A paper describes a structure:
EFhd1 and EFhd2 are homologous EF-hand proteins with similar structures. Although separately localized within cells, both are actin-binding proteins that modulate F-actin rearrangement through Ca2+-independent actin-binding and Ca2+-dependent actin-bundling activity. EFhd1Zn, EFhd2Zn and EFhd1Ca comprised two EF-hands, a ligand mimic (LM) helix at the C-terminus, a PR region at the N-terminus and a C-terminal linker. In addition, we determined that EFhd1 and EFhd2 bind actin independently of Ca2+ or Zn2+ and also exhibit Ca2+-dependent and Zn2+-dependent actin-bundling activity.
In the case of EFhd1Ca, CaCl2 was added to the protein solution directly to a final concentration of 4 mM. We crystallized these proteins and determined the crystal structures of EFhd1Zn, EFhd2Zn and EFhd1Ca at resolutions of 1.72, 2.60 and 2.80 Å, respectively, using molecular replacement methods [Table 1, Fig. 1(a)]. Because Zn2+ and Ca2+ have different numbers of anomalous electrons at the wavelength the EFhd1 data were collected (Zn2+ f″ = 3.9 electrons, Ca2+ f″ = 0.9 electrons), the anomalous difference map should be weaker in the Ca2+-bound state than the Zn2+-bound state. In the case of EFhd1Ca, the peak heights in the anomalous difference map were 3.4 and 2.7σ for EF-hand 1 (EF1) and EF-hand 2 (EF2), respectively. EFhd1Zn had peak heights of 23.0 and 14.0σ in the anomalous difference maps for EF1 and EF2, respectively. This suggests the metal coordinated in EFhd1Ca was Ca2+ while that coordinated in EFhd1Zn was Zn2+ [Table 3, Figs. 1(c) and 1(f)]. With EFhd1, the peak height in the anomalous difference map for the metal coordinated at the crystal-packing interface was 23.0σ in the case of EFhd1Ca. Considering both the anomalous signals and the metal coordination geometry, we deemed the metal at the interface to be Zn2+. When we superimposed the EF-hands of EFhd1Ca and EFhd1Zn and those of EFhd2Ca and EFhd2Zn, they both superimposed well (RMSD for EF1 in EFhd1Ca and EFhd1Zn = 0.100 Å for 38 Cα atoms; RMSD for EF2 in EFhd1Ca and EFhd1Zn = 0.088 Å for 35 Cα atoms; RMSD for EF1 in EFhd2Ca and EFhd2Zn = 0.157 Å for 30 Cα atoms; and RMSD for EF2 in EFhd2Ca and EFhd2Zn = 0.253 Å for 36 Cα atoms). The side-chain topologies of the EF-hand loop were similar between EFhd1Zn and EFhd1Ca and between EFhd2Zn and EFhd2Ca. This suggests the metal coordination geometries of Ca2+ and Zn2+ are similar within EFhd proteins.
Numbering used by the authors: 79 to 180
The structure:
Amino acid sequence: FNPYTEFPEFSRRLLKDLEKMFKTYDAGRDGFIDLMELKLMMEKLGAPQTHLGLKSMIKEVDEDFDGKLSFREFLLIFHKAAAGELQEDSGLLALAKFSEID
Ligand SMILES: [Ca+2]
Ligand SMILES: [Ca+2]
Ligand SMILES: [Zn+2]
């Protein structure tokens, strides 16, 4: 996985910022953000989600079908947001907008 060829529209600064955010919320430090971690991220960001809402969020970008978020799938969230691909009511969009990244 190469984030520079995969997401060429992301500056180096933005990549690091997102790496910083991913690491912040991977509380267990296993390299993934799972439903429990994502629950705590949405609470902290001011956009708390229901348990099925959080499952729906992950599902949207869970390209390896494992229930949790790899870094690349995390980045994919922000790609979609910046490309106009998230619905206006998506918790993923609340994630991107309330990250105060950018
Ligand atoms: Ca984790
Ligand atoms: Ca996954
Ligand atoms: Zn469940």
